[PDB]
Design a protein around this ligand. Sequence first.
Ligand SMILES: [Cl-]
Ligand SMILES: [Cl-]
Ligand SMILES: [Cl-]
Ligand SMILES: [Cl-]
Ligand SMILES: [Cl-]
Ligand code: NA
Length: 129
Amino acid sequence: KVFGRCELAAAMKRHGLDNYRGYSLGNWVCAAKFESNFNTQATNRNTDGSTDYGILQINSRWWCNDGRTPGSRNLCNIPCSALLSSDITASVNCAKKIVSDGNGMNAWVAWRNRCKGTDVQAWIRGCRL
Ligand SMILES: [Cl-]
Ligand SMILES: [Cl-]
Ligand SMILES: [Cl-]
Ligand SMILES: [Cl-]
Ligand SMILES: [Cl-]
Ligand code: NA
């Protein structure tokens, strides 16, 4: 599913990501924009042989199981393919664990390099939320 911007904002907000661990909704929308372009089906292989999955590009070394990543911990205890669903529940549940892990949203490289410090509220402009 390719979410619209405000579509995604609404769903993230309903699933409790607005200000989760202190990160406003626009931070999460910005992260999703630059991680996946709002496409739930996005997958990208990392240099280390792991793969990132879904709307928030969650990795198969620590967080989900894809069966082809040595050392997989599956700490979100889910198949990585479940992170590709049109329903963002599993991605949000897992993202809550990731952002709680100690470095906040810096865990997302696109967020640190493209969102952090910027006017992230722009990402929720216009939305009826
Ligand atoms: Cl956009
Ligand atoms: Cl915001
Ligand atoms: Cl594995
Ligand atoms: Cl959803
Ligand atoms: Cl933080
Ligand atoms: Na894994």
